[PDB]
Design an enzyme around this catalytic site. Structure first.
Site, PDB file in Angstrom:
ATOM      1  N   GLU A  11       0.811  -1.216   0.000  1.00  0.00           N
ATOM      2  CA  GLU A  11       0.000   0.000   0.000  1.00  0.00           C
ATOM      3  C   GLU A  11       0.843   1.264   0.000  1.00  0.00           C
ATOM      4  O   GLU A  11       0.376   2.305  -0.418  1.00  0.00           O
ATOM      5  CB  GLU A  11      -0.974  -0.024   1.192  1.00  0.00           C
ATOM      6  CG  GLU A  11      -1.961  -1.203   1.147  1.00  0.00           C
ATOM      7  CD  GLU A  11      -3.041  -1.051   0.062  1.00  0.00           C
ATOM      8  OE1 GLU A  11      -3.881  -1.965  -0.076  1.00  0.00           O
ATOM      9  OE2 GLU A  11      -3.059  -0.020  -0.647  1.00  0.00           O
ATOM     10  N   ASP A  20      -6.278   6.512  -4.916  1.00  0.00           N
ATOM     11  CA  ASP A  20      -5.768   5.143  -5.009  1.00  0.00           C
ATOM     12  C   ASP A  20      -5.837   4.699  -6.473  1.00  0.00           C
ATOM     13  O   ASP A  20      -6.151   5.502  -7.345  1.00  0.00           O
ATOM     14  CB  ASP A  20      -6.512   4.181  -4.063  1.00  0.00           C
ATOM     15  CG  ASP A  20      -7.948   3.859  -4.515  1.00  0.00           C
ATOM     16  OD1 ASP A  20      -8.622   3.152  -3.778  1.00  0.00           O
ATOM     17  OD2 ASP A  20      -8.442   4.307  -5.560  1.00  0.00           O
ATOM     18  N   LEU A  32      -8.947   3.905   2.685  1.00  0.00           N
ATOM     19  CA  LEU A  32      -9.917   4.534   1.776  1.00  0.00           C
ATOM     20  C   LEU A  32     -10.824   5.518   2.533  1.00  0.00           C
ATOM     21  O   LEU A  32     -11.366   5.182   3.572  1.00  0.00           O
ATOM     22  CB  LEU A  32     -10.758   3.462   1.049  1.00  0.00           C
ATOM     23  CG  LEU A  32     -11.960   4.029   0.277  1.00  0.00           C
ATOM     24  CD1 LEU A  32     -11.472   4.716  -0.998  1.00  0.00           C
ATOM     25  CD2 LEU A  32     -12.974   2.945  -0.069  1.00  0.00           C
ATOM     26  N   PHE A 104      -8.386  -6.629   2.907  1.00  0.00           N
ATOM     27  CA  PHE A 104      -7.980  -5.254   3.119  1.00  0.00           C
ATOM     28  C   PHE A 104      -8.143  -4.462   1.828  1.00  0.00           C
ATOM     29  O   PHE A 104      -8.610  -3.320   1.858  1.00  0.00           O
ATOM     30  CB  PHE A 104      -6.508  -5.224   3.594  1.00  0.00           C
ATOM     31  CG  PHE A 104      -6.000  -3.844   4.000  1.00  0.00           C
ATOM     32  CD1 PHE A 104      -5.555  -2.953   3.033  1.00  0.00           C
ATOM     33  CD2 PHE A 104      -5.885  -3.482   5.351  1.00  0.00           C
ATOM     34  CE1 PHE A 104      -5.073  -1.683   3.402  1.00  0.00           C
ATOM     35  CE2 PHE A 104      -5.375  -2.246   5.725  1.00  0.00           C
ATOM     36  CZ  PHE A 104      -4.986  -1.331   4.738  1.00  0.00           C
ATOM     37  N   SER A 117     -11.907 -20.048  -6.178  1.00  0.00           N
ATOM     38  CA  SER A 117     -10.561 -19.901  -5.600  1.00  0.00           C
ATOM     39  C   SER A 117     -10.546 -20.321  -4.138  1.00  0.00           C
ATOM     40  O   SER A 117      -9.658 -21.064  -3.707  1.00  0.00           O
ATOM     41  CB  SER A 117     -10.100 -18.457  -5.674  1.00  0.00           C
ATOM     42  OG  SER A 117      -9.893 -18.064  -7.022  1.00  0.00           O
ATOM     43  N   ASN A 132      -6.773 -19.814 -10.866  1.00  0.00           N
ATOM     44  CA  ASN A 132      -8.127 -19.238 -10.779  1.00  0.00           C
ATOM     45  C   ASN A 132      -8.116 -17.808 -10.202  1.00  0.00           C
ATOM     46  O   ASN A 132      -8.882 -16.936 -10.654  1.00  0.00           O
ATOM     47  CB  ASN A 132      -9.058 -20.144  -9.947  1.00  0.00           C
ATOM     48  CG  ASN A 132     -10.488 -19.708 -10.001  1.00  0.00           C
ATOM     49  OD1 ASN A 132     -10.963 -18.925  -9.161  1.00  0.00           O
ATOM     50  ND2 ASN A 132     -11.207 -20.199 -11.000  1.00  0.00           N
TER      51      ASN A 132
END
Ligand SMILES: [Cl-]
Ligand SMILES: [Cl-]
Length: 162
Positions: A11, A20, A32, A104, A117, A132
């Site tokens: 990040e 972002d 965010l 996250f 998945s 996948n």
């Protein structure tokens, strides 16, 4: 390496309000603020998040405090989610961090959408899950980050981060 060091690599850290990868107002370590196009709305969410009048700038301590809360919240969202919890419980400690990283980034609902998945991850079919996981908007929009997370799921080591 741990979940904190991993997400800090993924990040970055910026102490002033920024957009972002999706163009949304964000601060700190991928915190965010709002999906609204208004910087004023962002500044207002920021002041509320921090508890003081920030004018779009925070300190490092403040960024790390939001980060702690967001990692905590990502873990809480996994444990509360019927699709995410059994997968997380099945995983070793390194792969658990990969799942937290996804939540996250894209939220509990977004990750819960990776039905196939998640099933492969629970079954420990690592190479198949990795294939996948890559067939996703997630992978096509942020390939370098997604590859690092996928590699962590595939190998159960921190090699993509070292
Ligand atoms: Cl907050
Ligand atoms: Cl990326």
């Amino acid at each position: 390496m741990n979940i904190f060091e991993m997400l800090r690599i993924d990040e970055g850290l910026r102490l002033k309000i920024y957009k972002d990868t999706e163009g949304y107002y964000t601060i700190g370590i991928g915190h965010l603020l709002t999906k609204s196009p208004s910087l004023n709305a962002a500044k207002s969410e920021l002041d509320k998040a921090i508890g003081r009048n920030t004018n779009g700038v925070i300190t490092k301590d403040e960024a790390e405090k939001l980060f702690n809360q967001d990692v905590d919240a990502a873990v809480r969202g996994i444990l509360r989610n019927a699709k995410l919890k059994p997968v997380y419980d099945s995983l070793d400690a390194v792969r658990r961090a990969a799942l937290i990283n996804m939540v996250f980034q894209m939220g509990e609902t977004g990750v819960a959408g990776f039905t196939n998945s998640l099933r492969m991850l629970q079954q420990k079919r690592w190479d198949e899950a990795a294939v996948n996981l890559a067939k996703s908007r997630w992978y096509n929009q942020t390939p370098n980050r997604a590859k690092r997370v996928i590699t962590t799921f595939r190998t159960g080591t921190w090699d993509a981060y070292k």
